[model samples]
Target: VVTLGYWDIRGLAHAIRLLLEYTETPYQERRYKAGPAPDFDPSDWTNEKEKLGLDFPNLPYLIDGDVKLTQSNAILRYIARKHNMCGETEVEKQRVDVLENHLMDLRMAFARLCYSPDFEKLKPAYLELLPGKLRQLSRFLGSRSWFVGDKLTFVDFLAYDVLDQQRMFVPDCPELQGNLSQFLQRFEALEKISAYMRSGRFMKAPIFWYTALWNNK
Candidate 1:
């Protein structure tokens, strides 16, 4: 069976889980909990480090038997390629790559706000750029059902996850309304993905609430 390993929190693992569910791939998660109760503990993952046989040992690694993978984007692309979610042609693949990179920039921005110690000071500057980013996403999405071409690509998951985090952290952000609202609703309504979200297996939030800018406020 395919196995994906990550910390107990959703973090980077959730997107991988979404793709697996959508493709109906049967896989298991090896979750490492940083727990002295509910606090952030990494002892479990650290203990298993040397055994992973990874070229670059990192959290959120996936193993499909002998083929071990690291890096979230690379892992997602591998799954997408295997499942025919990348695209039909080279042009489509190029577009998907562009979309994936842009989506990741947004995700990184959200992560910065959540995890960086200087986020409180960075807030005002971040808010200034937020509108431009959101508008760009909305413009890129336009009226399309998926981020790339006609059918859904793996980058669609990236778009949706980034939007989800944005909604959680910045509810008043400009993009969630209009086209983005419908776009999100359509994604959430997908049969397997919808079930997965409600399946209790999906971790609702990443841990360390105090570290998140939304929670800090």
Candidate 2:
């Protein structure tokens, strides 16, 4: 079975876990956990880095048979191609890229809010900027079953992950409305994904939990 490696938290590797589950691909994961507050222990990863046999081994790396892939987006594209989730046409592929980039923007914004040392100071500006961005994404999505066409693609995971992460931070974030709301409902209705949500191994731990939100006052 393929071995996916990342921290126990569902931070960077959550989307990959979703795709693997949806495809019903059998794989195993080696999760490294962190320690106390600020800098959760990365020693589990760092200690083994030099011996991993990769030019640049990093967290969220996947070892699949003869292939060793790193970088979250690169891995997503690889798995998507394997499952025909990369779009079926040249034009469709172009649209997927457009959607993916925008989704990454939102994803990165959420990451910054959670990981940034200055998150509390940055929070106000981010909230103001977020609504307009969500509306733009809503415009792109309209009422399509998927972002690019009638079929799901890699970009769907990217968008879904961003939206899913957004909900964790701001439960009532206005983005989860209108077409976006329906889009999430459609994505969640996938049987394998829904099943994984219940019994899945993708973990969420204190390493990724943003306690700052509780003390944002």
Candidate 3:
């Protein structure tokens, strides 16, 4: 059995969880709860971080038998490699590699805004630039059934997560209603993904931690 460790909130682990479900991998979660607001103590995770035997200790870590890994993207690729979700051809591999980092850059920006003390003040600028960012992704995606082509790769999971977060953040953004909307719908319609969405374990809120200025519900 595989074990994934992360905070109780969605944070960086949602995509990992989604991929695990899509691959039908049997895994259990070790959810570390942070202390209440004001401080949001992380003692729960810090105390056990080093004992996990990870090369570089971090949240959203995964342990599978002898394989103990950290870093969210590294963990995603580890699972992706086992199932050939990385990509097939040279072009496909290039697309996957590019989008993987691109999506992370997007995700980190969103995270920064959410965790900022000036969330309300900084939000307008983020929203102002959001449409342009989303438009680039729309153009990249074009009419393809998936980002890299017809087939779903692990990066699609990453794209889904970041794009979905933007949609949730700005539900009325015009860019989100185009091909991106269709892409999201298609992803959710997958058998395993849909089943997981309907399951009791699905998390839809508190996308960040308690200390974050936004989406901490």
How far residue 159's Cα lies from its native spot in candidate 1, in Å, is 0.6
How close to the true structure is residue 178 of candidate 2, measured as C-alpha lDDT? 84
The worst-scoring run of ten residues by lDDT in candidate 2 lies at: 208-217
Candidate 3 clashes between residue pairs 3 or more apart in a chain or in different chains: none
lDDT of 2: 0.78
| Each model's Cα RMSD | 2.4, 2.7, 1.0
**Alpha carbon deviation, residue 99, candidate 3 (Å):** 0.6
lDDT of 1 by residue, 1-217 (tens): 7999987676777788899999998899887766564576668988889888999999789999889999999999989888888878888878888888887777777777767778788888887888788888888777777878699988888888778777777788765788888888899899998898888887767633434545413
Which of 1 and 2 is ahead in TM-score? 1
Highest TM-score model number: 3
User: How close is every model to the real structure, measured as TM-score?
Assistant: 0.91, 0.89, 0.97
Error of 2 at 69 (Å): 0.6
Give per-residue CA lDDT, model 3, range 1-217, as digits (tens): 9999998889899999999999999999999988877788889998998888999999889999999999999999999999988889999999999999999899999999988998889999998888899999999999899999878899999999998888778898888998999999999999999999999999887798787778836
Better of 2 and 3 by lDDT: 3
Cα displacement (Å) at residue 149, model 1: 1.4
